[PDB]
Amino acid sequence: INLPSLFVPLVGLLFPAVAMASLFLHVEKRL
């Protein structure tokens, strides 16, 4: 219920993980 507790991991761990995975996939493959 503590709003910071939910979001700090969400923006510091989940968001960078998904963003780095997606950008690595985009940058690193022939189109």
Partner: protein
């Protein structure tokens, strides 16, 4: 194409990791992108401007939301001088229990950060009082950023995208911006100050739900249209006036007193509203200069071409400059950056000496942070302006269309300019360092009385001419029968003279020999940075060592080791070397400001006066002396609230130091090392099953220089910010 980047076909075929790096570092250089045209370039710039506006609005909205949510505003407004404003809460799972204990301040229920941006004072002065106002502002700004993004997207789409001919309509844009963006905006700010801020500083709470039922003045708009405007200044606020209360409050909405508010030690709100109204009138009048669709006004190019002196000392004068400015976007960007940097430095210089926000003059760390902030940003903006001037020389300059005008004549006697600027730099450096070393040796031998202490007599004379009476020069405003003094005795001079001669504020500080020496160091820095940048620009198109430089682009590694060696021969490399000097000069500026103000805030201006004349005084009495609490932020016996800075202080020391890596070691060594690493990885069991897809390579020469400079700058900024904030906040005085 067919892979990142899609804007560069040459990069997309690079089989190395370079493609990624250079893929990121050229995304906003639209002119060098494949299949680029005029309208495409202008439309992309336009949309990017919209994106920037959206980002700015979102950022300030986030500041508002956090100050309203985990802030201290409602408590802060109750007692502005005895409570620390809160920026936002800390939620770090790495914190230990003592860290949580140490970081809970400001009356919060958990670890929080103490804001030093000064937003609390600014929002308090303009009229915001409760958290509801902050929430409404945040929501409005979120809507505003959304609208900005919508505008950008809309103008991206066909049938709404402006043509190039529209972008180059300079006369109409200047008219609208002067009379609209500047004039109407300042008129509206004056309206807000009259309607909300001034009533707010007198007890009344005027808001959207009741601002039509409240008269800003007892005789609203009667005096304005009748012409008897003095009725709006007939009853100012008494000198015994508490800010946000009606005790000793007046009814004047416009005035011109010139002093400070005695309690808040900041400018009168009525004076500021009057200022904004006046300059709004000036801008509105002056924005009707150029010709548009109505058959009257001016054509800029005709004014330019008509300004050619007879006698031909300037050649053809300004003939052809309109077309080279309108067609060259880098020229426009350079001019804009130059003016912006000048006025950013002006903001920095004026904010500390003439504070406008209530109770900010008593917040010392906020003042220091803001001054250092704006000075560093101004330095970066100036360096960028010169960089883009050089870029214009390389790319958008047409020698034949600029034949014999001021620009061509600047290019053709570049050597005299560079040599004389070099002479000025040499003179300043030689003599400033000589005097500093002389004084330092004199104090080494225990004979301070034999120093060369030169009184900054010209600056003291100017201060006396403003009305200060501590040097006994008896000049305009400081005399008794001078026309200048007598002309303003009944308007602003009372308050101005009361404020300037008062010696607890920063309005024209008393100056001495240390100030003379440090100002000459400042001049040395400015002249040398200008030397590097001017030399890089004027020689961008080519020189004797590389006459065909214009064909090699703005930035390139070198021209090989032939002809003696051509390291750092590009204009980009001149900008690169100028950034170091900019950092050094702004560092001297901020060192001087911070030491003077930290010694004044302690009532110990003498100490600075004695120890500023020699360099050991700077090293010991300022850096070493004011760096004890910071380095003690955490120690084997525990930590306190300053630990976060003590860590950052070390962090900034590391970044900077690793910057020295890329600046000293160069590519070949690293390339051979990476080659042997690739061999090793390819020759090992179980890991050769994993194969890289972009061939590893050492960083490019230009890229390595850029990375080294970025490390240098980040470390510089972080370490100085940590030191300044920890030392000023450690004492809070």
């Amino acid at each position: 194409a067919l892979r990142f980047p899609r804007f560069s076909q040459g990069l997309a075929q690079d089989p190395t990791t370079r493609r990624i790096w250079f893929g990121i570092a050229t995304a906003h250089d639209f002119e060098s992108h494949d299949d680029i045209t005029e309208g495409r370039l202008y439309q992309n710039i336009f949309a990017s401007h919209f994106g920037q506006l959206a980002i700015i609005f979102l950022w300030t909205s986030g500041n508002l939301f956090h100050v309203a949510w985990q802030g201290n505003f409602e408590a802060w407004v109750q007692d502005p001088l005895h409570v620390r404003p809160i920026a936002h809460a800390i939620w770090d799972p790495h914190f230990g229990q003592p860290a949580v204990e140490a970081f809970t301040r400001g009356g919060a229920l958990g670890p929080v950060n103490i804001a030093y941006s000064g937003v609390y004072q600014w929002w308090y002065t303009i009229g915001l009082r409760t958290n509801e106002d902050l929430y409404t502002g945040a929501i409005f700004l979120l809507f505003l950023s959304f609208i900005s993004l919508l505008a950008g997207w809309l103008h991206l789409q066909p049938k709404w995208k402006p043509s190039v001919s529209w972008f180059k309509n300079a006369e109409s844009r200047l008219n609208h911006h002067l009379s609209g963006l500047f004039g109407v905006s300042s008129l509206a700010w004056a309206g807000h100050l009259v309607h909300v801020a001034i009533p707010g500083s007198r007890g009344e709470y005027v808001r959207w739900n009741n601002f039509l039922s409240v008269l800003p003045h007892p005789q609203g708009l009667g005096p304005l249209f009748t012409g008897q405007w003095n009725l709006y200044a007939q009853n100012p606020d008494s000198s015994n006036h508490l800010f946000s209360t009606s005790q000793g409050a007046g009814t004047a909405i416009l005035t011109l007193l010139g002093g400070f508010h005695p309690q808040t030690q900041s400018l009168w709100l009525t004076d500021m509203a009057h200022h904004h109204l006046a300059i709004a009138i000036l801008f509105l009048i002056g924005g009707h200069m150029y010709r548009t669709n109505f058959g009257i006004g001016h054509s800029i190019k005709y004014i330019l071409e008509a300004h050619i002196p007879p006698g031909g000392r300037l050649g053809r004068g300004h003939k052809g400059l309109y077309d080279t400015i309108n067609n060259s976007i880098h020229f426009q960007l350079g001019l804009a950056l130059a003016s912006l940097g000048v006025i950013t430095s002006l903001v920095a210089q004026h904010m500390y000496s003439l504070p406008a926000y209530a109770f900010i003059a008593q917040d010392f760390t906020t003042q220091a942070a803001l001054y250092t902030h704006h000075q560093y940003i101004a330095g970066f903006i100036m360096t960028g302006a010169f960089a883009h001037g050089a870029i214009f020389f390389i790319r958008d300059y047409n020698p034949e269309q600029n034949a014999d005008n001021v620009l061509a004549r600047m290019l053709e006697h570049k050597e005299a300019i560079i040599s004389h600027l070099s002479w000025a730099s040499l003179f300043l450096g030689f003599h400033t360092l000589g005097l500093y070393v002389h004084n330092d040796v004199m104090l080494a031998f225990g004979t301070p009385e034999k120093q060369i202490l030169i009184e900054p007599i010209f600056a003291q004379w100017i201060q006396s001419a403003h009305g200060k009476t501590s040097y006994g020069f008896d000049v305009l405003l400081s005399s008794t029968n001078s026309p200048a003094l007598n002309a303003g005795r009944s308007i602003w001079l009372p308050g101005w003279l009361n404020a300037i001669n008062e010696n607890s504020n920063s309005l024209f500080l008393t100056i001495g020999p240390g100030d003379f020496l440090v100002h000459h160091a400042i001049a040395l820095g400015l002249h040398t940075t200008t030397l590097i940048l001017v030399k890089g620009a004027l020689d961008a198109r080519g020189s004797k060592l590389m006459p065909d430089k214009k064909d090699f682009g703005y930035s390139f590694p070198c021209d090989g080791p032939g002809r003696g060696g051509t390291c750092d021969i590009s204009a980009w490399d001149a900008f690169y070397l100028a950034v170091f000097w900019m950092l050094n000069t702004i560092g001297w500026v901020t060192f001087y400001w911070h030491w003077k103000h930290i010694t004044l805030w302690q009532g110990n201006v003498s100490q600075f006066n004695e120890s500023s004349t020699y360099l050991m005084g700077w090293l010991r009495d300022y850096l070493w002396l004011n760096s004890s609490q910071l380095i003690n932020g955490y120690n084997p016996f525990g930590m306190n609230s300053l630990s976060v800075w003590a860590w950052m202080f070390l962090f900034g020391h590391l970044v900077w130091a690793t910057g020295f890596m890329f600046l000293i070691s160069w590519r070949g060594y690293w390339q051979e090392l990476i080659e042997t690493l690739a061999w090793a990885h390819e020759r090992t069991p179980l890991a050769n099953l994993i194969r890289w897809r972009d061939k590893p390579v050492a960083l490019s020469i230009v890229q390595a220089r850029l990375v080294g400079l970025v490390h240098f700058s980040v470390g510089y900024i972080f370490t100085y910010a940590a030191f300044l904030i920890a030392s000023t906040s450690g004492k809070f005085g």
